[PDB]
């Protein structure tokens with residue numbers, strides 16, 4: 001999959017277009033890894049998977065997500081406030097489809113306001129525009 | 134020669150603001166199109182700020198000066214969910230302006246140390262009319278005052294005094310510190326930012342932990358670390374302008390129970406400086422330089438950064 | 451490999467949460483690369 005020029009330029013229209021695009025998220029990830037903030041995209045996808053994946057795996061998936069992104073000192077510990085975390089940790093006691101909505105929104109805005117802006121000005125994105133068919 | 138400089142500190146201590154000043158002072162500065170990009174950030178900061186105060190009204194059980202505001206508050210919360218993030222519709226700003234003028238909201242705003250409120254809440258809210266005036270263009274101060282939580286490690290480069298700076302900006306929250314180790318190699322100098330006005334606040338990550346106590350533990354660990362024996366360490370006691378105002382109404386004893394001095398800028402400020410500097414249990418050998426700063430003041434930052442460069446120059450023999 | 455370093459049992463939150471890099475205080479900077487921490 002090689003994005004056309006119009007498609008890649010569209011990633012700059014707004015964050016929603018970039019992250020809602022498979023190739024966009026892949027390009028954005030290369031950038032986040034560069035800034036050591038890849039856990040945010042990892043967490044966002046884990047949430048999307050939990051919500052629209054096999055609804056019988058919710059419990060397992062939620063436990064795994066907690067262990068990887070929420071537990072104090074987690075390998076991919078995410079940057080959310082105490083309240084949001086409290087809300088999430090309580091909800092996880094009794095898992096469900098949208099139990100990570102609060103945390104996911106916070107992390108979404110985190111990337112949009114901070115990482116996204118720099119992404120559009122990075123060499124990585126300029127190159128995506130270059131190789132654009 | 135090249136200089137690797139690290140900006141370290143707890144969350145919201147002023148690091149990224151210092152980076153913006155480097156852009157304004159030692160780089161290209163901000164263009165019109167660049168400033169326009171901060172509008173959504175500012176509108177976002179403004180709405181989040183008023184919403185936090187409105188929520189604290191119930192949390193601290195403070196009554197509105199006028200009951201008609203109770204309805205305005207309800208409507209603001211509703212709109213907050215429907216409006217496009219980063220926008221400030223006429224109907225929303227009119228509501229915010231009325232709430233801001235309410236004596237109850239003001240009483241709540243003055244008790245901000247009791248909840249979580251953006252530093253620039255007052256700055257933006259007190260001048261909301263200017264911000265929503267057709268043709269509004271963020272000034273440099275409006276940009277410096279903006280708030281965006283940083284995640285990750287970000288590098289910026291510039292030359293000064295014939296030195297090539299590679300300045301690293303990191304996020305300060307607990308979860309972000311797991312990443313700090315990644316830029317600890319070959320560090321020429323470290324600027325550790327402490328928010329002086331944090332003495333009566335608690336962490337956004339842990340509502341039970343006093344913010345200044347957290348900074349102290351961080352500085353203690355950083356200034357006594359083996360990896361930085363040859364590193365120049367400079368302490369920036371930031372937000373002196375906010376501290377100057379806060380010390381008039383909030384006792385330093387909230388942080389240091391034993392403090393017996395007067396609650397004045399000079400005395401309290403020096404006391405805090407001393408509590409941090411004495412964490413250096415190698416004070417004999419190497420000295421830690423410190424400066425009272427206001428990161429949103431371009432002239433102050435220009436001056437202090439000049440003195441930091443001198444140190445680095447002097448230290449590199 | 452930064453999470454495969456031994457000797458983490460017994461240390462308090464001051465290290466595991468507040469000052470994470472302290473878990474590697476027994477290592478020299480050149481060893482951090484060698485052991486895949488950085």
Ligand SMILES: Nc1nc2c(ncn2[C@@H]2O[C@H](COP(=O)(O)OP(=O)(O)O)[C@@H](O)[C@H]2O)c(=O)[nH]1
Pocket residue numbers: 142143144145146147148149150151252253277278279280281282283305326371372373374375426427428429430
């Ligand atoms: N009044 C005032 N605000 C400041 C000062 N320093 C940072 N701020 C504001 O405090 C908030 C946090 O600063 P920021 O640089 O993002 O902190 P960082 O969290 O350490 O990166 C922003 O809204 C800044 O404009 C200061 O010295 N005085």
Ligand code: ALF
Pocket residue numbers: 142143144145146148149281282283284303304305306
């Ligand atoms: F609170 Al920060 F960088 F420390 F946004």
Ligand SMILES: [Mg+2]
Pocket residue numbers: 148149150281282283302303304
């Ligand atoms: Mg920052």
